[PDB]
Amino acid sequence: EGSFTSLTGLLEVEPLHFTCVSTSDGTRIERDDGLALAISHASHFLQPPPHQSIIIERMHSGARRFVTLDFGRPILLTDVLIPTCGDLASLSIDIWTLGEEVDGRRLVVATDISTHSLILHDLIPPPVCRFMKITVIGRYGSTNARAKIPLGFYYGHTYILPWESELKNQPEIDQHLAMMVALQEDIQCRYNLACHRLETLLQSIDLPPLNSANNAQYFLVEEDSRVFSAYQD
Amino acid sequence: IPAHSLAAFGLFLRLPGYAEVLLKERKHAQCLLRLVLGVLPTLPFHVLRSLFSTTPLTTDDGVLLRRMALEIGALHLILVCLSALSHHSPRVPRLEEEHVTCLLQVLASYINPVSSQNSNALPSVLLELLSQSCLIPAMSSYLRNPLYRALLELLRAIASCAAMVPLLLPLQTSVGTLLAKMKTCVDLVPDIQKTAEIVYAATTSLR
Amino acid sequence: ETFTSWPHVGYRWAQPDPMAQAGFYHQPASSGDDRAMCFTCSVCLVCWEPTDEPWSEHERHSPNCPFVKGEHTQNVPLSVTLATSPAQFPCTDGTDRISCFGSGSCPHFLAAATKRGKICIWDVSKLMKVHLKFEINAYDPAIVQQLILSGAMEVSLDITALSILQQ
Amino acid sequence: SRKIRKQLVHHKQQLNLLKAKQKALVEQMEKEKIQSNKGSSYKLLVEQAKLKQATSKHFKDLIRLRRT
Amino acid sequence: AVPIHSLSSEALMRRAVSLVTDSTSTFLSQTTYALIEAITEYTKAVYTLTSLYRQYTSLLGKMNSEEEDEVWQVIIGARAEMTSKHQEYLKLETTWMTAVGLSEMAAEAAYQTGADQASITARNHIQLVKLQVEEVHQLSRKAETKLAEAQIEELRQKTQE
Amino acid sequence: HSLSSEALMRRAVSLVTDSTSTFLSQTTYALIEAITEYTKAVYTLTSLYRQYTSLLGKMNSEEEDEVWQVIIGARAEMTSKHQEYLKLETTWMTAVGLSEMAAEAAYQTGADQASITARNHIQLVKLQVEEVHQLSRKAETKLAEAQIEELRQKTQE
Ligand SMILES: [Zn+2]
């Protein structure tokens, strides 16, 4: 739990959504289990996609697989995280914006996937890309049994600034700032009303004489779930 | 829940007397308003259908409501919504099925409220605008194929008002003959037969 | 040389030379098959791909290969043969003296002409082999009309300089 | 007619099911061929012959049914 | 690219048992056929005798002695045919019992060898042939009941005349 | 050629009387093979125990530990051989019952020739299996005698 300090400053970089465009032989990707309209779409753009994973059909000593992923737009990549996959030998990651051989460049060839997760924090300078290339190779003596390989969560700035543009049709900053401000005001009203309903919910709890032993006894009821949901919101 | 119905609802509630029929069902109206601020997609047009049916052309309220609808452009919005749902372009000079049925019902209630001095009760501006929309090619394509009863109600509605009869003429197979052959092929039956006979009578009277 | 019948010459990484460099030879079970076996470990592979790197595939399918490990095997590189190649005669008999030689804008081929008119052009860029072996005929109609324009006919020709030209 | 049809379908259902048995038979001929376990191949050839007789008798019944 | 032998005794089990869970299944359905064939032809003879009793009973009192004798001889011959075919049928069902047990304990062998798929296929086939055999059985008992009703009504009208 | 029902059984039962005889042959062979392999292993361990007995007191602690570890590994090999032994003998018992009641089925069909052939095969496999059972049991008894001699000399020293 001490190593959990590997990813810091996650507030300033927004979550990015994923689209599966290419996969390899015996490999698949699954999901692990008008102002208001523009505001809702922008809010949905800034959401963490649910957990997803790669499932491989046939594993062997040196199982070589290739996947391509698209965000739908050139987006700054600032932080990466690959969860631990103890049954794989190594991976490589390359990114590009237009073509694989046009602007493709190698990013990492990591052979330490089995023992620890992959952490690479605060990409400096932040590259921009839209397409992503993954090459993975299985461990020697691998048992041919199915397993999950989560992709992790990827963060960056979808909207690009002029100086971030000059490294490698952008709408003007003012109107984009105005509509995100509108989203902020709307989420402020929503946050106030949701937290307020949570306050009324907690005020709807009958309080006997204070015996916190009974308060702990409540762990071992629909009320707990509804307060959990309200706090979640 | 398609966004176009919710967007049209905000304009629809501007009409006086819309809230009076909207408040009949409190729960669904509250849920719709909650979705607006930030079965359900049928209601933004279903409330309009009820308002059109309850307000006849024999009274000043219905004709005023209809001319305000022309003025603000609700009919253009419902026509382009129908165009997007049916993949049919206008004559330039499973949820989708239920949506098309509700839109056709709204149009039928707008023309003839009783179907759910009436010739000049609807201005010919509606006639010339409805001569440019997507209603005729889409209805023609659907003829060549709940919704069927709504379409028959739309036909008796569009034939009920005299000023609206001329758009039944194709721009060369007549609608009455096509309806007669499909009715014979299908043979619910008495209603289809009666509406087919009424449509044929209206087309013959116009010709 | 085993990869003459390779059906995937147009592939990027499945070219005959790089996969021969990894120490593999074409031994297909049927004509048109891309089956190959190594000369050191004899791992067998089929259904090759244009992206299959020779060293990477040999290492992945045979990390225990001494060729993969860099260990001393019985491999004989082409450079050893090239640096010890026994001089090829311009003619099969090996008696005619060489009048001239050289190269021009296309020095991939080396030409050697004899005094009797026999000229042999080698593919010295590639492995030492005979590429062209011929004799110049002095009774050529073009040569005949060129000599006629200069003024039984007896014509003799001797090559004094050689050059190979290309665009 | 229904009954005869039923046994026609049954013979078709069993002839391929023994053809797959011939396939596994050939596989097992190959597999014990490499390892010289002398006493194996004799009983395996007996396996091959018995399944051949079952194969041939099913073909003859396949023919005779269609006669009827 | 992709890759293109003293076998242990367990593979030999999986192989040897896969030879038998199918061929006992073969002779299982072959018993199911032959048994159905007897249950069909014997039912044909039973329905023939039922029809003979219906026409003889309906024509009672309308024939002479010679006609009654010829009809009664036809009825006796049909009785002997159905009886003998039923005697064959009993030995056919006696054999399909053994075929059922053969496939059941062959599937037990397949489960003992790790070839679970052959075991489940054999067992599901046993239940399928059991359903088919019980269906044709109930058809046979239906026709026997019809024949019994025709014999009792023949005796009743014969007593009446 | 409208075949009767009796000829269908007379031809049909020959399939299982050859197929369960095939299973009985492969189980009998493999059981004989596993018995012979286990008998050879037991003889090898018997030789190891006799050699360990004959070397007692002539080796240091390390060599005694090494030979004891080899004996332990051989014991584990016997355990795995005995497990496959019991499973093979189980399947051979199942095959014996299979061919016996299959030949009984051939008897009740009147196809007695296939039945008697299966019968003679059952007696042949029973005698062969019991023979190599006796050989295995003789090897086990010899191993027990070697172990007793090993314990006697170890206690004596
Ligand atoms: Zn090699």
Instruction: Give yes or no for E87 touching D (CB within 8 A).
Output: no
DSSP state of A171: P
Approach to solving: cryo-EM
Cβ density class A180-205: b for 16+ within 10 Å, e for less: eeebeebeeeeeeeeeeebeeeeeee
The residues facing C44 across adjacent strands are C37
Query: Using an 8 Å Cβ cutoff, are B101 and B143 in contact?
Result: no
| Distance (Å, whole) CA F108 – CA F115 | 9
Q: Which helix (H) or strand (E) holds A82?
A: strand A80-82
Dihedral sign, CA of C5, C7, C10, C15? negative
Indicate the residue type of F57. G
Contact between chain E and chain C (3 or more Cβ pairs less than 8 Å apart): yes
Sheet containing A27-31: order of strands: A27-31, A52-56, A148-150
Query: Using an 8 Å Cβ cutoff, are B58 and B23 in contact?
Result: no
What's the token pair of residue A220? 């071992």
Contact between chains at E3 and C43 (C-beta distance less than 8 A): yes
Contact between chains at E40 and D35 (C-beta distance less than 8 A): no
Query: Using an 8 Å Cβ cutoff, are A193 and A111 in contact?
Result: no
| Distance (Å, whole) CA A177 – CA A189 | 18
Instruction: For residue E29, give the chain F residue with the closest CA.
Output: F12
Nearest to C167 by CA among C86, C80, C106: C106
Instruction: Give yes or no for D64 touching E (CB within 8 A).
Output: no
Contact between chains at F8 and E102 (C-beta distance less than 8 A): no
User: Which domains are assigned to chain F?
Assistant: 3-152 (1.20.58.70)
Coil/strand/helix, residue C133: strand
Contact between chain D and chain C (3 or more Cβ pairs less than 8 Å apart): no
| Distance (Å, whole) CA F52 – CA F35 | 25
| Strand C44-46 versus strand E2-3 pairing type | antiparallel
Q: Helix/strand/coil (H, E, C) string of A147-164? A: CEEECCCCEECCCCCHHH
Indicate the residue type of F13. V
Indicate the residue type of A28. R
Catalogue the E-assigned strands of A6-147.
Answer: 14-15, 19-22, 27-31, 52-56, 64-76, 80-82, 88-96, 105-110, 118-120, 128-138
Q: Report chain B residues touching chain A, CB-CB < 8 A.
A: 3, 7, 36-38
Residues on chain F touching D61 (C-beta within 8 angstroms): 3, 11
Question: Which residue bears the tokens 């990114």?
Answer: A95
DSSP state of B122: S
| Distance (Å, whole) CA B26 – CA B28 | 6
By Cβ distance, the residue of E9, E99, E109 closest to F33 is: E9
Residues on chain A touching B38 (C-beta within 8 angstroms): 36, 39-40, 186, 190
What's the token pair of residue D38? 């002398």
Return the number of CB contacts < 8 Å for E and F.
Answer: 101
Instruction: Give yes or no for A41 touching B (CB within 8 A).
Output: no
The residues facing C100 across adjacent strands are C113
Whether residue A125 is preceded by a cis peptide bond, meaning omega within 30 degrees of 0, is yes
- Mutation pick from B4, B37, B77 vs chain A, by most beta carbons of A within 10 Å, is B37
Coil/strand/helix, residue A110: strand
What's the token pair of residue E100? 């059922």
Contact between chains at F26 and E15 (C-beta distance less than 8 A): yes
The residues facing A96 across adjacent strands are A131
Coil/strand/helix, residue A34: coil
Measured in angstroms, the CA of A62 and the nearest CA of chain C are apart by 6
Nearest to F16 by CA among C35, A132, C146, E24: E24
Contact between chains at E1 and C52 (C-beta distance less than 8 A): yes
Distance from the Cα of residue D14 to its chain's centroid: 9
Query: For residue A99, how far is its CA from the centre of ligand 1 (angstroms)?
Result: 35
Reported resolution in A?
Answer: 7.2
Contact between chains at D35 and E6 (C-beta distance less than 8 A): yes
Question: Radius of gyration of chain A from Cα atoms?
Answer: 22
Question: Which residue bears the tokens 């030209």?
Answer: C165
F75: left (phi over 0), alpha (psi -120 to 50) or beta: alpha
Query: For residue C53, how far is its CA from the centre of ligand 1 (angstroms)?
Result: 14
Instruction: Give yes or no for E36 touching D (CB within 8 A).
Output: yes
Coil/strand/helix, residue C104: coil
| Strand A52-56 versus strand A64-76 pairing type | unpaired
Contact between chains at C48 and E4 (C-beta distance less than 8 A): no
Instruction: Give yes or no for C63 touching A (CB within 8 A).
Output: yes
